[PDB]
Design an enzyme around this catalytic site. Structure first.
Site, PDB file in Angstrom:
ATOM      1  N   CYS A   1     -28.044  92.486  73.427  1.00  0.00           N
ATOM      2  CA  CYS A   1     -27.086  91.497  72.942  1.00  0.00           C
ATOM      3  C   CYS A   1     -25.658  92.026  73.004  1.00  0.00           C
ATOM      4  CB  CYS A   1     -27.444  91.080  71.517  1.00  0.00           C
ATOM      5  SG  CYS A   1     -27.768  92.459  70.395  1.00  0.00           S
TER       6      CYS A   1
ATOM      7  N   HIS B   1     -27.654  90.214  65.517  1.00  0.00           N
ATOM      8  CA  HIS B   1     -27.437  89.714  66.867  1.00  0.00           C
ATOM      9  C   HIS B   1     -25.954  89.712  67.206  1.00  0.00           C
ATOM     10  CE1 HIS B   1     -28.224  87.870  70.602  1.00  0.00           C
ATOM     11  NE2 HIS B   1     -27.934  86.625  70.274  1.00  0.00           N
TER      12      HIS B   1
END
Lengths: 107, 81, 98, 95, 93, 278, 66, 93, 99, 84, 95
Positions: free
Chosen positions: F75, F135
Site C-alpha cells: 500500500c 492502510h
C-alpha cells in the site's frame, strides 16, 4: 343477591377472584378454566405457610417477635428444597449464613 | 464533571466484603481486579436499565427498571417491588 | 510491649462480626457518584430515584460476596489460604462470565 | 539461561537495566566491543578517538521498543535452541 | 391511584400459623414479591404447556403439571395434595 | 512477500531516494491547520483497512496511472507510485521513467502485476524490513482535479475541481476532515492512529534558491532518518546476549536485576529462574 | 496546567512541573488516553521535542502518533 | 398435514451470499431451529416490554428495543440499521 | 389488482405474512402493529445471512462445497458475538474446537 | 421385557477415557470413572424426570423427541438439530 | 515403545477433529430405559429421543471435563482427580 366469595367456599385465605382476574389479564391463554384459580391459590397459600413457619421459628430463635428479612434469609437458605427453588434469588438486607471454612481455623 | 470515581471503592470496603465472604488472608493485587469486575457488572446492569428507561420516554431511572434489568440477567431481586 | 495479637485472629473476629450483620458495607456517596459517572456515558442529564441506587448497591454487594466465596473455595483448593487474582479469574472463567 | 521463556529476564525491566550507567561500569574493551554492534552515528567520535555512547543513544524510542520486543520474543520461545535450528532450516530452504 | 398487593392475606396466614408474631414492612414487601414471582412462574409454565399441545384453555390439569415441573420433591407432593383437596371442596360447593 | 513499512516521513523519503527520485522529500503534517501544508505534490494518508466485515453488499482511465494492489503490504509503495508517476514536476529518475513508459498502457491489474515483479522497487521496499491493520491511500492533483488513489479501489475517485493546480491544500483538507469523521463515527476522540504526510519539493533547494540553518536542519533530519533506518534494520539479539553475558560474568547483573524486577511477586506468577543458571 | 492538542483536535489538560521530562509528559498522556509513550511524539512552538529533555529546556503542545 | 419450515427462505439467503455452496438436511434443520428460537426470544421480550408500559400494541419500537436488549453490540447496531432501512423502504410502496 | 407480496415491497427474502400470522396466533399481545413483522423479518434475515456467510467461509476453508453441522459449530464458536449470543445452546453433531 | 440392572457399568472405562480425551485431558486418575458415572446418572435422572412428566401430561405412552427437547430447554440447555 | 504422554496427545488431536458419538448405543439405551422405568412403568421411546439424550449427555460431560482440566491445571497438576470434579460442580452452582 347476597355475595359469597369463592375463596370462602374452598376454605382458602387468598383472593381466588383476584387470581382469576390476573390470569385473564395476563394473556397467558385465550380462555381460562374455572378450576385453575382454586388450585393456584391453594398452592400459593401452602408455599406462603411453609415460608412463614420457617421464618417464625428462625425469628423466635433470635428472641424477637417481629419477622425481619434476616429471618427470611435464614429460613430460606437453611432448608434444602426452598433453597433449591430460590437458588437465583437475592433478598435485600438478608446477610449470609454463618459458616467458616475448616482450613482457615487456627492451628 | 465526575471523573475516576472508581477509586471511591476504598480498600477497607473490599476488605470488609471479603471478610463477609469468609476470606482469611488477602493479596495486594485483589483490589484492582475487584474494581474491574464491579465496573463491568455495573456497566451491564446500568446499560439494560437505561435502555428500559429510554423505551418509556422518561428521564428518571426508577427502581422497577433496575429490578427488570436484574431479572433479565438472572439476578432476581426481592424487596423493591 | 503493648498487647499485640497473633496474625489471623482479628481476621476470624471480623469474619464473625461481618457474617452476623446485615448492613451495607459500601458507603453511599462514593457508590452513587460511581453509578452516575457510569451512566453519564449512555445518556446525559439522567436522574436517579434513591431506591434505584439502593437496589443497585444491594445487587452489587450480593454479587461480590458470592464471587469472593467462590474465590476462597478455589484458593483453598490450591492448598493456599491467601486469595490471588488468578483465583478470581478462574472462578469467573468457570462460572461462564468470560 | 538467556534464551528460555522461563528466565527471570522475561519479568525484568531491561530498559532501566541497560543504560548509560550500565555502559560506564563495563571495561573499555567490552564497551568498544558492544559499541561495534551499534549504528555508525550513535558512536560519537570523541576527542581521544574512542567512540562514545551518545547522550540519546540508548534512551531511544527505537531502542526501548527493541528491548520490549526482545523480551516479548523471549516470552514467545523464539530464542530457544530448537526454534533457532528451525529458523536455520527455513533460511536454508529460502536460499 | 391505588397499588394493590397481597399484604392482608399474608398477614392472615401468619396469624393463623404464629398468633403472637408480627412482621416488618420490608419483610411484607419481600413476601409479596415472592408471591408475585411464584405466580408468574407458574402461569408462564402453564401457558407454554397449554400451547405445546395446541389447546385453547388453562385448566386445573395444566396447573397441576406445571406445579409438578417446578416444585422439587416433597414441596411438589404437598402442593399437589393441597390443590386436589381445594379443587374437590370447591366443586362440591 | 513484502513487509509493512512504518508510517515515518523519513522512511518514505529514503524510499523515494532509493527509487531514484531527486529534488523531492517527504514531510510530516502534524495538524490540520491551513498553515501546516504549503506547496505539495501529493498527500499520503493512513487510517486502516480492517473495515471488511459488512462486505457482499470516462477517458481519464487512459491518462491516470493507477495500479491495483495485487500483492500484500504494498500500500505504501502503491501510494508513492500514485503520487510520483502522476506528477511531472519531479525527476522520476531512469527507473521510474522506464516503469512508467513500459506500464503506461497496461490495465490497473497489469500495472500492479508489473510493479510487483520490478526488482529495484521490491529491493527498496524490503530494505526497511525488520529481521488491527492499517492502510495507505494517496491524494493527487491530476488535470486540475483531486483524485484519491487506493490500491483496493477500482479507480481514482474524483472529488471535484481544484481551486488551482498550484494551490490545492484547502480542498484536500476538508476531504481529510471527512475521512477522519467517518472512522471515529462522530466524536473524533475514538481513534487516533491516523497519519498524514506530504510529498513536497526539496526544501534545501528552495532555501538555497531564495536558511543556512534550515539547510543544517534538513541535513540533520536526513542523518536522523539514516539512523532510524539502521536501527530498524539492526538485529540486537547478539548484542543483548553479549551484554547480559558480560554483566553476569562481571557480577553486578544479579543485583541490578533483583533491583529492577518488573512484576510484583508472591502473587501466583512464576517469577522464573535466575540468569545464567539453567 | 498545560494543554495538549491532537490531530483530531482533542484537548488534554495536564498538571505538570517545569522539571518534568518529555517521558513524564508522555506517561501522563498514556495514563489519560491509553496510548503508549513509545508511539507518542510532542511538538512545541513548531518543534518536535526529543526524548530526555525537560519542559524548561524548550502552554499548548501537539501530540502525534506513529 | 403440512408442516411449515423456513427451508426455502434460508436457501434463498444462502444462494444470495454463497452462489455455489449447498447445504445438507441436518444443517437445514439446525438453521430452522435457530430461527424459531430467536423469533420466540424476541417475541417474548417484546411482549413483556409492551406489558410493562401498560400498552396493548406491539409496534416497531418495541421490537427495536427488544433487539437492543438481546443482541450484543455490533449485532444490535447492524440489526437496528437493517430494520430501519426495511421499514423506511416499506412505508412508501 | 395483481397480488404483490409484502416481502417484495420491503426487499426481503423472509415471509412477512407468516411472521405476522405467528405474532397474532402466539398471544404475544392483544394487537399487532403493521410495522412489527417487517422489522422482525429484517432482523431474522440479517442474523441468518451472518451465520450462513461464516459457515460458508468455514466450509470453503475445508475444501468442501456442502455445509454440515460441524461447519456451523466452527463458525459460531469462532465469532465472539455469535458465541456470546448462543452461549447456552448445544448443536447436535457439533464437536469441539481444536485447542 | 427383561429387567435392566447395573447398566451404569455399561458406560465402560474406555468410553470415559475417550470423552476426557475430547475435552483435552492428558492424564486421568482412577476414581474419575465412578465419579463420572454418578454425575451422568444424576443428569439423566433430572432430564428423564422432566421428559416423563411432559409425556404423561399429554396422555401418551411413547416419549417423543420433542418432550426431551422441551425438558432440555426448560433446564436451560437448549438443543438444536431435532426440531423446535 | 512411545514415551508415556505421546499416545494421549495423538488421541486428543484425533478426537478433537471428529464429531461422531463416543458412547456405545446399546448400553446407553439400556441405561436410559432402566432409569426411566422408575418414574413410570411400561414406557416406549422413539429412537430420536434416545439420540437426543445421548448427544446432550455427551456435550455436558465434555464441558464438565474441560472445567475439571482447568481446575487441575490451576492446582499445579496434570492429572484430574475427583475433588477437581466436585469443585467444578460446586462452582457451577449445580450442587
Amino acid at each position: 343477591a347476597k355475595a359469597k366469595t369463592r375463596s370462602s367456599r374452598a376454605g382458602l385465605q387468598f383472593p381466588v377472584g383476584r387470581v382469576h382476574r390476573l390470569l385473564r389479564k395476563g394473556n397467558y391463554a385465550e380462555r381460562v378454566g374455572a378450576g385453575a384459580p382454586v388450585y393456584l391459590a391453594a398452592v400459593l397459600e401452602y408455599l406462603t405457610a411453609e415460608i412463614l413457619e420457617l421464618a417464625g421459628n428462625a425469628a423466635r430463635d433470635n428472641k424477637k417477635t417481629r419477622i425481619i428479612p434476616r429471618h427470611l434469609q435464614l429460613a430460606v437458605r437453611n432448608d434444602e428444597e426452598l433453597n433449591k427453588l430460590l437458588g437465583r434469588v437475592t433478598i435485600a438486607q438478608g446477610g449470609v449464613l454463618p459458616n467458616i471454612q475448616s482450613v482457615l481455623l487456627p492451628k | 464533571v465526575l471523573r475516576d470515581n472508581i477509586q471511591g471503592i476504598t480498600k477497607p470496603a473490599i476488605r470488609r466484603l471479603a471478610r463477609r465472604g469468609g476470606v482469611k488472608r488477602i493479596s495486594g493485587l485483589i483490589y484492582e481486579e475487584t474494581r474491574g469486575v464491579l465496573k463491568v457488572f455495573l456497566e451491564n446492569v446500568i446499560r439494560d436499565a437505561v435502555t428500559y428507561t429510554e423505551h418509556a420516554k422518561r428521564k428518571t431511572v426508577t427502581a422497577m427498571d433496575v429490578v427488570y434489568a436484574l431479572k433479565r440477567q438472572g439476578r432476581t431481586l426481592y424487596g423493591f417491588g | 510491649k503493648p498487647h499485640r495479637y497473633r496474625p489471623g485472629t482479628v481476621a476470624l473476629r471480623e469474619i464473625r462480626r461481618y457474617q452476623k450483620s446485615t448492613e451495607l458495607l459500601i458507603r453511599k456517596l462514593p457508590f452513587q457518584r460511581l453509578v452516575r459517572e457510569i451512566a453519564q456515558d449512555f445518556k446525559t442529564d439522567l436522574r436517579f430515584q434513591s431506591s434505584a441506587v439502593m437496589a443497585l448497591q444491594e445487587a452489587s454487594e450480593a454479587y461480590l460476596v458470592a464471587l469472593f466465596e467462590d474465590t476462597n473455595l478455589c484458593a483453598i483448593h490450591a492448598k493456599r489460604v491467601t486469595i490471588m487474582p488468578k483465583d478470581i479469574q478462574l472462578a469467573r472463567r468457570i462460572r461462564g462470565e468470560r | 539461561d538467556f534464551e528460555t521463556p522461563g528466565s527471570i529476564l522475561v519479568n525484568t525491566n531491561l530498559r532501566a537495566l541497560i543504560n548509560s550507567r550500565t555502559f560506564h561500569a563495563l571495561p573499555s574493551h567490552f564497551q568498544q566491543q558492544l559499541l561495534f554492534l551499534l549504528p555508525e552515528v550513535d558512536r560519537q567520535v570523541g576527542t581521544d578517538g574512542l567512540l562514545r555512547l551518545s547522550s540519546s543513544a540508548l534512551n531511544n524510542e527505537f531502542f526501548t521498543h527493541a528491548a520490549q520486543s526482545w523480551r516479548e520474543r523471549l516470552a514467545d520461545g523464539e530464542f530457544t535452541h530448537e526454534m533457532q535450528v528451525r529458523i536455520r532450516q527455513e533460511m536454508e530452504k529460502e536460499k | 391511584t391505588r397499588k394493590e398487593s397481597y399484604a392482608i392475606y399474608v398477614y392472615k396466614v401468619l396469624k393463623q400459623v404464629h398468633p403472637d408474631t408480627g412482621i416488618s414492612s420490608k419483610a411484607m414487601s419481600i413476601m409479596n414479591s415472592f408471591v408475585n414471582d411464584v405466580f408468574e412462574r407458574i402461569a408462564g409454565e402453564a401457558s407454554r404447556l397449554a400451547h405445546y399441545n395446541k389447546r385453547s384453555t388453562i385448566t386445573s390439569r395444566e396447573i397441576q403439571t406445571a406445579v409438578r415441573l417446578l416444585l422439587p420433591g416433597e414441596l411438589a407432593k404437598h402442593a399437589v395434595s393441597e390443590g386436589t383437596k381445594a379443587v374437590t371442596k370447591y366443586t362440591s360447593a | 512477500g513484502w513487509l509493512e513499512l512504518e508510517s515515518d516521513p523519513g522512511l518514505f523519503t529514503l524510499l523515494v531516494e532509493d527509487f531514484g527520485v531527486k529534488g523531492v522529500q517527504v514531510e510530516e503534517i502534524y495538524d490540520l491547520q491551513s498553515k501546516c501544508q504549503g506547496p505539495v505534490y501529493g498527500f499520503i494518508f493512513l487510517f486502516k483497512w480492517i473495515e471488511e466485515r459488512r462486505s457482499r453488499r470516462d477517458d481519464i482511465v487512459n491518462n491516470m496511472f493507477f495500479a491495483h494492489q495485487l500483492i500484500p503490504n504494498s500500500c505504501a509503495t502503491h501510494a508513492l507510485l500514485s503520487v510520483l508517476l502522476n506528477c511531472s514536476s519531479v525527476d522520476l529518475g531512469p527507473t521510474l521513467s522506464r516503469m512508467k513508459d513500459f506500464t503506461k498502457g497496461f490495465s490497473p491489474e497489469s500495472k500492479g502485476y508489473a510493479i510487483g515483479n520490478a526488482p529495484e522497487l521490491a529491493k527498496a521496499h524490503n530494505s526497511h524490513a525488520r529481521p488491527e491493520a492499517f492502510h495507505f491511500v494517496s491524494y493527487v492533483p491530476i488535470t486540475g482535479r483531486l483524485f484519491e488513489l487506493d490500491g483496493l479501489k477500482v479507480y481514482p475517485i474524483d472529488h471535484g475541481p481544484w481551486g488551482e493546480d498550484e494551490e490545492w491544500t484547502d480542498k484536500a483538507r476538508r476531504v481529510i476532515m471527512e475521512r477522519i469523521g467517518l472512522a471515529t463515527a462522530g466524536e473524533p476522540y475514538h481513534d487516533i492512529r491516523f497519519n498524514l504526510m506530504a510529498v513536497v519539493p526539496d526544501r534545501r533547494i528552495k532555501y538555497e534558491a531564495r536558511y543556512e540553518a534550515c539547510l543544517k536542519e534538513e541535513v540533520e533530519k536526513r542523518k536522523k532518518f539514516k539512523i532510524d533506518d539502521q536501527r530498524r534494520t539492526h538485529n540486537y539479539d547478539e548484542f543483548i546476549c553479549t551484554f547480559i553475558s558480560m554483566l553476569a560474568q562481571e557480577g553486578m547483573l544479579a543485583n541490578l536485576v533483583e533491583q529492577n524486577i518488573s512484576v510484583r511477586r508472591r502473587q501466583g506468577v512464576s517469577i522464573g529462574r535466575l540468569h545464567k543458571q539453567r | 496546567q498545560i494543554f495538549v492538542k491532537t490531530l483530531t483536535g482533542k484537548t488534554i489538560t495536564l498538571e505538570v512541573e517545569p522539571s518534568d521530562t518529555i517521558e513524564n509528559v508522555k506517561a501522563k498522556i498514556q495514563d489519560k488516553e491509553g496510548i503508549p509513550p513509545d508511539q507518542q511524539r510532542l511538538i512545541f512552538a513548531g518543534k518536535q521535542l526529543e526524548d530526555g529533555r525537560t519542559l524548561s529546556d524548550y502552554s499548548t503542545l501537539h501530540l502525534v502518533l506513529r
